[PDB]
Each structure stands twice: as C-alpha cells, then as structure tokens.
Swiss-Prot record:
GO terms for molecular function: metal ion binding; serine-type endopeptidase activity. The active site is at 32 (charge relay system), 64 (charge relay system), 221 (charge relay system). Keywords: Calcium, Hydrolase, Metal-binding, Protease, Secreted, Serine protease, Signal, Sporulation, Zymogen. GO terms for biological process: fibrinolysis; proteolysis; sporulation resulting in formation of a cellular spore. Its EC number is 3.4.21.62. This is Subtilisin BPN'. It comes from Bacillus amyloliquefaciens. Coiled coil: none annotated. Secretion of subtilisin is associated with onset of sporulation, and many mutations which block sporulation at early stages affect expression levels of subtilisin. However, subtilisin is not necessary for normal sporulation. Its cofactor is Ca(2+). The gene is apr. Used as a detergent protease. Sold under the name Alcalase by Novozymes. Optimum pH is 9.0. Monomer. One of its GO terms (cellular component) is extracellular region.
Length: 275
C-alpha cells in the first residue's frame, strides 16, 4: 500500500508532520530535469523549463527530477510512499537536458525564475567540478532576497585532502549535503570538504519514478532532498522566520556524526531545528 521510507523517520519530519506542519504554504523549486505530473504520488504546483529544446517542464526522460521530488513530497493517502515536505507547493523547474545536459547558463536563469516567483526553498541536487563567476553571483542573489539555497555537495570521495564538493555547493551561501546511511556512516561516495555543511540520508533512498512507479537511488543528490524539506516545514511552523534564521536553526541542531570534513555539522534534525 503506502510506505515510509527509512531516511524520512531517521531524521524526523514525521515529528513535525504529526505536530501538523507539512509546509502547506511553502515553495521548494526542484532544480533538476522534470517531474511527471500524472504520477499518483505527486502534486505539482507548477514551474517552467530553462531548457531551450524541451517545451514541457513536466517531461522527465532522465527520471531523477521525479526521483528527487519524492523525498521532498510523495502522496498523503494509500499508495506509494511518503514525502518529507509532503505538503509543499512544488515548483517543477527544469534546467537539465535529457542524457544529462549541463548548460550553466540554464542553471542560472533557473535560479532566476525561481527568484521571480518568490520561492522560499531552493533545491539543486546537481553541481560540477568547475564553477563560474555568475553561478555564485546568483547563488548569492536567492539567499539575498530570502531563499534558502540547498544542493548536493557532490558524489566524489577523497583525492588526498583537497576538496571534491562541487559547485554551487562549495560556494558558502549554500547548504551542501553529504550522504549518510541509516547507521549514520558516511557513504563512500560522498564528497569531503570544508564547504560540506550537513549530512543526510543518501543511500538506498527510495522514491517516485515515472509510469506508475517508484524506485531507489544512492546519491548525494537523494540526500539533498531530505534536507530541503526539513526546511519547508521549518518554515511552515516559523513561516515568519528569516532565510538566515533558517540556515542557523539548521546548522546548530543536527546530530554530530564525525569529523567536520566527511560529516559537516552532522545529521539534520527537523525536530531540534523546528522547535
């Protein structure tokens, strides 16, 4: 029937959930490649595409769009699983190409559109080994206005001690998510860096998949979605709170996991950060 995903209880959205807050009047933009709107677990509120050749923003070939948009917010009924901002207003913003189309200029005008309709929560479960002057220009802008910009830190590992968190995650106005498992070990593929902010549910995180389906993925970019929603709902309770009031209540309440550079602050606790 309907199933609670191991990472959702493990941070504790459902403490906030049975408290009544699910992020009804919150919006998370899911900055990926799509979001099937005929998926029985998803209610998408709207969005757009920033990909030139891909009309529908509600066409996801690459499958990750939908996958991600499900730790964030699958159903509330008797089918599939259980999202973690299960009540958000969710904005399908497309900037990825099928196959994996990487145009940085797609990425930026994506934050944009996001700025322009008042997004409260921003989620980018992408990034790369090179940056760009603009990227981190905008990146500043969304938080400036008052958006909380949340990304995947990235899926490298070590390479000695320098740092494999990628862009826009490395740029400090962002909350970069490292993956842990249910035993709060950091996943061998989770990037390491100074610039690593918190740790989250990234291994075998099962979510929504097109054609009446669901499935599971290992990703610094499956954790990144837990993280974004704790925040919704943080906001749902303290909807008056600043974009910064919020980062703060997030950095300083996790669960400590292990040295800062594999783990960051450790594990994000929705119930501690919420109140």
């Amino acid at each position: 029937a309907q199933s609670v995903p191991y990472g959702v209880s493990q941070i504790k959205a459902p403490a906030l959930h049975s408290q009544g807050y699910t992020g009804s009047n919150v919006k998370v933009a899911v900055i990926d490649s799509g979001i099937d709107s005929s998926h029985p677990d998803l209610k998408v509120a709207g969005g757009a595409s920033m990909v030139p050749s891909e009309t529908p923003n509600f066409q996801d070939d690459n499958s990750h769009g939908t996958h991600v948009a499900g730790t964030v917010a699958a159903l509330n009924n008797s089918i599939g699983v259980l999202g973690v901002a299960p009540s958000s207003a969710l904005y399908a913003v497309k900037v990825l190409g099928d196959a994996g189309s990487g145009q940085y200029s797609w990425i930026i005008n994506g934050i944009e559109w996001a700025i322009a309709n008042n997004m409260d929560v921003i989620n980018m479960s992408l990034g790369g080994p090179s940056g760009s002057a603009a990227l981190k220009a905008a990146v500043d802008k969304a938080v400036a206005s008052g958006v909380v910009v949340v990304a995947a830190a990235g899926n490298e590992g070590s390479t000695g001690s320098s740092s494999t968190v990628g862009y826009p995650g490395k740029y400090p106005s962002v909350i970069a998510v490292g993956a842990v498992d249910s035993s709060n070990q950091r996943a061998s593929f989770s990037s390491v860096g100074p610039e690593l902010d918190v740790m989250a549910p990234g291994v075998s995180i099962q979510s929504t998949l097109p054609g009446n389906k669901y499935g599971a993925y290992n990703g610094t970019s499956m954790a990144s979605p837990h993280v974004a929603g704790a925040a919704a709902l943080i906001l749902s309770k303290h909807p008056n709170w600043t974009n910064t009031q919020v980062r703060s209540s997030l950095q300083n309440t996790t669960t400590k996991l292990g040295d800062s550079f594999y783990y960051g602050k450790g594990l994000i606790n929705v119930q501690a950060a919420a109140q």
